[PDB]
Enzyme design. Sequence first.
Site, PDB file in Angstrom:
ATOM      1  N   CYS A   1       3.284  19.619  -3.059  1.00 53.84           N
ATOM      2  CA  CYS A   1       4.728  19.635  -2.940  1.00 53.84           C
ATOM      3  C   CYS A   1       5.169  20.234  -1.603  1.00 53.84           C
ATOM      4  O   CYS A   1       4.358  20.757  -0.834  1.00 53.84           O
ATOM      5  CB  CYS A   1       5.317  20.436  -4.075  1.00 53.84           C
ATOM      6  SG  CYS A   1       4.997  22.155  -3.799  1.00 53.84           S
TER       7      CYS A   1
ATOM      8  N   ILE B   1       6.515 -12.614   5.208  1.00 51.88           N
ATOM      9  CA  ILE B   1       6.592 -13.998   4.766  1.00 51.88           C
ATOM     10  C   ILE B   1       7.983 -14.582   5.111  1.00 51.88           C
ATOM     11  O   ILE B   1       9.007 -14.081   4.660  1.00 51.88           O
ATOM     12  CB  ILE B   1       6.322 -14.094   3.239  1.00 51.88           C
ATOM     13  CG1 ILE B   1       5.001 -13.399   2.855  1.00 51.88           C
ATOM     14  CG2 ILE B   1       6.310 -15.533   2.783  1.00 51.88           C
ATOM     15  CD1 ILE B   1       3.746 -14.088   3.354  1.00 51.88           C
TER      16      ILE B   1
ATOM     17  N   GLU C   1       9.576  -8.408  -4.119  1.00 52.18           N
ATOM     18  CA  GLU C   1       8.224  -8.568  -3.592  1.00 52.18           C
ATOM     19  C   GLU C   1       7.821 -10.046  -3.731  1.00 52.18           C
ATOM     20  O   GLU C   1       8.025 -10.648  -4.794  1.00 52.18           O
ATOM     21  CB  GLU C   1       7.272  -7.568  -4.289  1.00 52.18           C
ATOM     22  CG  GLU C   1       5.769  -7.811  -4.167  1.00 52.18           C
ATOM     23  CD  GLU C   1       5.237  -7.789  -2.735  1.00 52.18           C
ATOM     24  OE1 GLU C   1       5.350  -6.750  -2.039  1.00 52.18           O
ATOM     25  OE2 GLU C   1       4.661  -8.826  -2.326  1.00 52.18           O
TER      26      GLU C   1
ATOM     27  N   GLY D   1       0.801  -1.214   0.000  1.00 54.81           N
ATOM     28  CA  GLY D   1       0.000   0.000   0.000  1.00 54.81           C
ATOM     29  C   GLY D   1       0.834   1.264   0.000  1.00 54.81           C
ATOM     30  O   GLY D   1       0.484   2.221  -0.686  1.00 54.81           O
TER      31      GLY D   1
END
Lengths: 493, 495
Positions: free
Chosen positions: B369, B233, B155, B135
């Site tokens: 910004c 994991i 990933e 996310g």
Amino acid sequence: AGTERRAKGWIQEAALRMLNNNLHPDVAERPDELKAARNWECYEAIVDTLLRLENDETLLIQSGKPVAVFRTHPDAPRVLIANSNAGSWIYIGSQGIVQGTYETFAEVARQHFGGTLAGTITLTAGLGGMGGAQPLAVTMNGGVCLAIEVDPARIQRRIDTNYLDTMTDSLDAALEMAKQAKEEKKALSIGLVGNAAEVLPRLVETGFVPDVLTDQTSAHDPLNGYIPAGLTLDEAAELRARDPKQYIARAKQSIAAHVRAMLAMQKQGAVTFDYGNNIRQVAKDEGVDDAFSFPGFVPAYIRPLFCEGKGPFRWVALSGDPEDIYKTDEVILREFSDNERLCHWIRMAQKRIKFQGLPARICWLGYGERAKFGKIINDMVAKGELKAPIVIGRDEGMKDGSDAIADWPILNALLNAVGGASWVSVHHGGGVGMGYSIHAGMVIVADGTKEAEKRLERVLTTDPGLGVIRHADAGYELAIRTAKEKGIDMPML
Amino acid sequence: VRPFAGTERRAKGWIQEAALRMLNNNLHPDVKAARNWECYEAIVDTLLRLENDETLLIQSGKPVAVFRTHPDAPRVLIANSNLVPAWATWDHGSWIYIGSQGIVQGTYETFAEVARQHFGGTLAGTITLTAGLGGMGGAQPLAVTMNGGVCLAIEVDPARIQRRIDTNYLDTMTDSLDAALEMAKQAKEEKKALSIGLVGNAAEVLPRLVETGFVPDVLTDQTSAHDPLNGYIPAGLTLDEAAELRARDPKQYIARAKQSIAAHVRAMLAMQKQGAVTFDYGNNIRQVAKDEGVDDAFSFPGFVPAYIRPLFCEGKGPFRWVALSGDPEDIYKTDEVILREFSDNERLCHWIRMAQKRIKFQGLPARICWLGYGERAKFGKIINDMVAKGELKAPIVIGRDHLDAIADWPILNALLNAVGGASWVSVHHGGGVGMGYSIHAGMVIVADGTKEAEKRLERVLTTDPGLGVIRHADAGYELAIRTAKEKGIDMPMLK
Ligand SMILES: NC(=O)c1ccc[n+]([C@@H]2O[C@H](COP(=O)([O-])OP(=O)(O)OC[C@H]3O[C@@H](n4cnc5c(N)ncnc54)[C@H](O)[C@@H]3O)[C@@H](O)[C@H]2O)c1
Ligand SMILES: NC(=O)c1ccc[n+]([C@@H]2O[C@H](COP(=O)([O-])OP(=O)(O)OC[C@H]3O[C@@H](n4cnc5c(N)ncnc54)[C@H](O)[C@@H]3O)[C@@H](O)[C@H]2O)c1
């Protein structure tokens, strides 16, 4: 001090005088220490900054420290205070405590005895820092006060200092005097030296039942506060240093018989309430589930005054002239005489309350009433009827389960700041385990000017009106009625 | 949802109109705002009739009162609470959300400050190695490539990696470490920007990369190391083998997860030793490894103390603005004024240029910004002049989103912005008994081209960043003390 300022404007000068007043010998506990500022370098820095602060600048106080000055505009607050966890600067000594206890017993009179305690006996206990106001509040409502207290030196302090009429070590002597005054409908306060856990069951036993019954012992602190039954002061203290396990146990055991006597006096018809000393919780936790058969004074007596917006309104005479307060005392008499507990208060305060530091008054005024009085006060400063400006200021089982909502005091602070309160404070504190509270207060200076008159009109509508909305949103009828009656705009109603 | 859009207002004023349009922008599908649909309709109804000298109060999404105030007060004061009851503890805004541009540019800001500090102002000719495309981790590839760098991102979930390519966050992927490695060094040599997703477990890949002599220029991690039962994991387990173990034997899973994280962190220590610029990206990985006995786990810094805190000390922070007209060209015109007016700041100007190609607008066109003390008020005035001239088609919303004693500061910030004439101000109260409490404050101010708005913009765009400098100068940060003294911020206790 006096009719002329050293600061660049009267709000800055008020802040200085209220700050200095907080450490006045007759106002403060230990003014060489406590807290108005974080420490003595912060105190000196606040005073130096307030003397050179311009009328379009705002000082930020962050937990007692003057951290910054920013350019704002002349109708902004000169000071904004957010303190963690106590300086909102408008402490006026014991008159706040006395008049708040007066108000509780004044509502107890309206609800049950035709608007006076004449011909009643209030029975209570504890004459300590807050409890000592109980006998003066009861007698100022016309009543007979019997107050049980274990420390003779606390009874002697209240007598020497005119908070208590008399005392006795004899229960049946205390009883025979209280019944005399009740039959004559005379106002009289009697301090009975004795232990509430021992005396109150002896009263139930002997048939006696008071008209009104509270307690203000230190039951919230069953180790350093509440003296257990069967113990003298020196016996109790020797067990407290040595064996606090079996002290708290005896202390909690004594709180139970105390409340069971209060419960028994409740069934014989006494109006009986808790006064915030956590005494039902300790009795239920010791093993009496009926403990909450009687209610707390706030849900019982204060909350309905908040529903019409009524709240503690204080004002301080920056001249240091007591006649400034006596002049503003009359205007309350001229224009709130339909509220006789309020007018009775002003006259009894003129004779019983002495001033401490700057002359000051406090009383309770509702929605509409506050702005009315701020407008009259500001006109009299302008005409010179008052010698210098007036500081005006204001320093839970909710129907809908809304007890924990911090939104309200934040909107209150934000809305009073945007209205042009002279300074605004937010005190906040709590964390894991013990929860979270937030409180906002506000001061506005009546310095005589037309600009002050606009801010006064804004801020003294907005502050009580949001208390009305807070209770109307929680579903209280009297608050929904007051909001409709007085024209308060609630988009969902 | 009733539309309010375009160059005309249905409300009595443009702040009331902006509140309606921002309220509806948060309920946009391509991007709750009120307590329920009944509160949403009363807020909309009340905002249509609200006068220019009245203020509406929102308490936890519900409109509870309107009060007479004055034309320079906020039109809306918002105070919201999200308290979790004690029993719910173990189950683990100012209406200015503008989609995922916020997370992308916050991550760009981290890697632009790393580029300033270590690589001469650009990431061209560098490889950053990280892990996690989740996310927030999914923004890393764009943040590195928009800074000119090559990014190699490990990933475990291949379908997650393909969604980032499908959706223009990532350039390419592979399950081959040697293919990923040859692609990344190719781009580093050509000084070309490229992001590569490698399907892999960082606790297996990083130890291997240390063994092959490969060293990145920059190294971080955004795996879910903060949650070793449901997040991280363990090395050796497919996603399906991880989910079966997760449910059958939680304690074996957690032991393998924590011990994989120790391996992962030791490999980051080995690359820092060989010269990688390395840092923690707020995922708790150093502390888990320290609790596993990696005694030197804190020998690389966290990204805020290292790179972001120094920007706060000079007052710089996220500054966002929204074009209420709906015309994306209102944003592109204000971008050009950033390019003329702050042309000294190369990473800002490079961000504006890259954002026009890479950021797609979601809901009302908006730009974010970082601008600091002095810079915000200067931009705020030029925008207000452009709305006054009709060079912008409608007013611009300018905002700072929300993101005991710590709690004094947001309360003073809210009180100060309200008093300076913010168009609206919001305070959020969060937490519960059993976890502690938090306060956040945000604000919005509308540049509607008026002289009254110009005076409020000058006050509020000065007080909002000045208070962050003062908080840092009070806490002892020399960069913030230097900024307070150079910029003339009045601090009664300083020196
Ligand atoms: N919430 C409110 O508006 C409010 C107002 C007034 C009092 N209170 C509560 O009432 C309590 C009293 O406050 P305080 O400041 O007066 O405390 P305090 O400690 O100063 O006084 C308590 C008094 O009780 C006496 N006492 C102890 N054991 C006794 C016993 N067994 N029998 C008779 N007297 C005994 C002590 O000698 C002392 O004088 C506190 O819990 C306070 O919070 C609350
Ligand atoms: N404080 C901040 O400003 C900040 C900013 C960005 C990220 N973070 C932190 O970074 C972490 C990631 O945030 P998120 O929202 O992206 O979480 P997330 O759950 O969406 O994503 C984490 C990703 O890690 C991957 N992953 C798990 N184990 C892995 C392994 N062994 N090797 C490679 N990938 C693995 C998962 O497949 C997942 O896609 C969080 O702990 C977050 O708190 C903090």
